[PDB]
């Protein structure tokens, strides 16, 4: 072995000064997101649907148009399901695919499948369209600072397909895209040429976005080995606050509260967690009230909470990457 698989345990962020926090907050627009990034994602988009494709395309078009040098893979692939073999398509977007080490942001871009019911269709605006767009926006806003990557550490985005069960939740039916990738990754050597290290050794932290966009969200600290990064999220919230750069926000309705969580939620982090990647699992607890109902729509999203999280998330990242 070498020892760069351990740099991640000692990596510390480069915190920002008020002046620079001001720039980031100004730097993101929730209304360009609602419109250019998000509103096209609010379609049925279950696996194999024409929405999976148009969403898939959408996602790319919007990255493909930034200036940073995003390398875009489509891991199309086949997996068995209760209704038989079916075709899935993960989207990986990478800066510096040799960037030996990577911080990874991820969501799922699929939407559960439901029959239409009294003319209503499920689009998951929280589950998980807001996370997709949040990621899209982050690329957009950080684009100029992200150019400065031509520590051997860059950023990677993943939009998994196939997160939701088709019929009914169970290990055998769920997490199609991330069960695949987790494993295809553990058996790809990194960097090219390596001999005992995989692409999983270069995932410093997997930051997973799930179920985001409802009001009054509260995220637990799930794992002890990413706690310190959670504590950063706390602090970034507290300070963006104390400087007036959050909207409709108060410390008694914080998002990241130093309460921990008992059990585990299953999600696209599990395939990775179980292989030892450190996961920062930004899923709120309790779930949104509209969870897995046709009311998980745009009408019930909370614009101001998304905007605040964009700013929190964009800071955490630049801080982690020392940009």
Ligand X SMILES: O=C1Nc2cccc(O)c2/C1=C/c1ccc2[nH]cnc2c1
Among residues 119, 192, 131, the alpha carbon closest in space to that of 158 is found at 131
Contact 210, 282 (CB under 8 A): yes
State whether the Cα torsion 290-218-278-319 is positive or negative.
positive
Contact 239, 21 (CB under 8 A): yes
Phi, psi (5° rounding) for residue 59?
-55, -45
Q: Given phi > 0 = left and psi -120 to 50 = alpha, else beta, which region is 219?
A: beta
Contact 123, 109 (CB under 8 A): no
Interacting residues of 4 by C-beta distance below 8 A, sequence separation 6+: 100, 101, 152
State whether the Cα torsion 314-315-318-319 is positive or negative.
negative
From the list ligand X, a copy of itself, Zn ion, none, partner contacted by residue 12 (C-beta under 5 to 8 A by kind): none
Distance separating alpha carbons of residues 67 and 9, to the nearest angstrom: 31
Q: At 306, list the tokens.
A: 């998304």
Q: At 143, list the tokens.
A: 């684009």
- For residue 211, state whether it binds ligand X (rule: CB under 6 A): yes
Q: How far is the CB of 128 from a copy of itself (least distance, A)?
A: 15
Is 37 part of the annotated catalytic residue set?
no
- For residue 110, state whether it binds Zn ion (rule: CB under 5 A): no
Q: How many residues touch Zn ion (CB under 5 A)?
A: 1
Judge whether 249 is annotated as a binding position. Answer: no
Choose the binding region for ligand X from 4-12, 39-47, 221-229, 306-314 (rule: CB under 6 A).
221-229
With CB under 8 A as the contact rule, the residue among 39, 50, 82, 98 that binds a copy of itself is 82
- For residue 260, state whether it binds a copy of itself (rule: CB under 8 A): yes
Distance separating alpha carbons of residues 65 and 70, to the nearest angstrom: 9
Q: At 34, list the tokens.
A: 């609602």
With CB under 8 A as the contact rule, the residue among 54, 60, 121, 194 that binds a copy of itself is 194
Is 163 part of the annotated catalytic residue set?
yes
Within 5-44, the residues that bind a copy of itself by CB under 8 A are: 6, 9-10
- For residue 180, state whether it binds a copy of itself (rule: CB under 8 A): yes
Q: How far is the CB of 156 from a copy of itself (least distance, A)?
A: 19
Within 41-60, the residues that bind a copy of itself by CB under 8 A are: 48
From the list ligand X, a copy of itself, Zn ion, none, partner contacted by residue 20 (C-beta under 5 to 8 A by kind): none
Distance separating alpha carbons of residues 306 and 304, to the nearest angstrom: 5
Interacting residues of 186 by C-beta distance below 8 A, sequence separation 6+: 198, 199, 200, 275
With CB under 6 A as the contact rule, the residue among 225, 257, 285, 293 that binds ligand X is 225
Of residues 44, 210, 296, 319, which has the active-site annotation?
A: 210
Q: How far is the CB of 127 from ligand X (least distance, A)?
A: 4
Q: How many residues touch a copy of itself (CB under 8 A)?
A: 52
Of residues 110, 137, 161, 163, which has the active-site annotation?
A: 163
- Give me the helix-helix angle, 18-27 and 227-242, nearest 10°: 90
- For residue 127, state whether it binds Zn ion (rule: CB under 5 A): yes
Query: What is the binding site for a copy of itself (CB under 8 A)?
Result: 3, 6, 9-10, 48, 76-87, 114-115, 117, 165, 167-170, 180, 186-189, 194-198, 224-225, 227, 260-264, 274-276, 285-287, 291-293
The residues assigned a catalytic role are 163, 210
Query: What is the binding site for ligand X (CB under 6 A)?
Result: 127, 164-165, 169, 210-211, 223-225, 265-267
- Report the binding-site residues for Zn(2+): 127, 164, 292
Query: What is the binding site for Zn ion (CB under 5 A)?
Result: 127
């Amino acid at each position: 072995a070498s020892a760069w698989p351990e740099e991640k345990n000692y990596h510390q962020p480069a915190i920002l000064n008020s002046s620079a926090l001001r720039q980031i907050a100004e730097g993101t627009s929730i209304s360009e997101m609602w419109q250019n990034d998000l509103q096209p994602l609010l379609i049925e988009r279950y696996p194999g649907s024409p929405g999976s494709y148009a969403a898939r395309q959408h996602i790319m078009q919007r990255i493909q148009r930034l200036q940073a040098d995003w390398v875009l893979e489509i891991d199309t692939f086949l997996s068995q399901t209760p209704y038989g073999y079916r075709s899935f398509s993960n989207i990986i977007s990478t800066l510096n695919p040799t960037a030996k080490r990577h911080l990874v942001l991820a969501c799922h871009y699929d939407s559960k499948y439901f029959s239409h019911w009294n003319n209503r269709v499920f689009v998951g605006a929280t589950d998980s369209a807001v996370p997709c767009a949040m990621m899209l926006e982050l690329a957009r806003a950080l684009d100029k600072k992200l150019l400065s990557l031509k520590p051997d550490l860059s950023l990677q985005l993943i939009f998994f397909d196939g997160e939701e069960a088709f019929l009914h939740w169970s290990p055998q039916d769920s997490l199609y895209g991330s069960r695949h990738l987790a494993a295809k990754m553990a058996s790809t050597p990194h960097p090219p040429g390596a001999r005992g290290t995989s692409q999983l050794h270069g995932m410093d932290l997997l930051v997973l976005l799930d179920l985001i966009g409802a009001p009054n969200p509260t995220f637990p600290n799930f794992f002890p080995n990413s706690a310190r990064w959670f504590e950063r999220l706390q602090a970034i919230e507290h300070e963006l606050h104390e400087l007036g750069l959050l909207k409709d926000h108060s410390l008694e309705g914080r998002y990241f509260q130093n309460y921990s969580y008992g059990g585990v939620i299953q999600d696209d982090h599990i395939p990775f967690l179980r292989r030892g990647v450190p996961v920062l699992h930004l899923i709120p607890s309790p779930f949104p009230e509209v969870w897995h109902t046709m009311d998980d729509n745009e009408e019930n999203l909370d614009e101001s909470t998304i905007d605040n999280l964009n700013k929190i998330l964009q800071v955490f990242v630049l801080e982690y990457l020392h940009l």
